[PDB]
């Protein structure tokens, strides 16, 4: 679950 959250934050940094 943790893994999972990571990378969705990874995605929403790159957004910008």
């Known amino acids: 679950l943790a893994a999972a959250a990571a990378a969705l934050a990874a995605a929403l ?4």
């Not at 940094?13 to 910008?16: I, K, T």
């Open 13 to 16: 940094a790159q957004a910008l």
